Symmetry: C2
Subunit: 79 residues, 2 copies
């Protein structure tokens, strides 16, 4: 019985060409997944990586935040 | 190499008094656990709940949601 739900993550990194890097690859596995759950407007601008999300509900979200915070570490791993 | 990582969350609920129950459960659970890592600012204000989370890294950020989102979703099921 949970209604409208929204999440926002920012992250800090060493080089912009290391935020460029982390942001720009997590993107290719985000474009490579149609049928997402449930709403996203990821974006890098500096050395921050910005993640804003939405979920029909409490868990339409949690498993997705998981999904991408690993994917974001999975990206830190090759660096 | 993820320097500081932060997620602000907001949940809107049926009754400004059905959310008051969840706060209280979770808050209890967030507080029947001193030594609680990493950083959590739990504030019920209105029909909305705002879970502020500051962490050491993506991973820190990550698991300090699951157990806490899965607490919220727990409170939800005793109603």
């Amino acid at each position: 019985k949970a209604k409208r739900v929204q999440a926002k993550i920012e992250m800090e990194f060493p080089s912009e060409d290391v935020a460029k890097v982390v942001y720009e690859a997590v993107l290719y596995e985000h474009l490579s997944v149609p049928y997402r759950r449930s709403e996203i407007d990821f974006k890098l601008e500096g050395k921050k990586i910005i993640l804003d999300i939405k979920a029909t509900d409490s868990s339409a979200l949690r498993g997705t935040v998981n999904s991408y915070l690993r994917w974001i570490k999975a990206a830190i791993d090759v660096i």
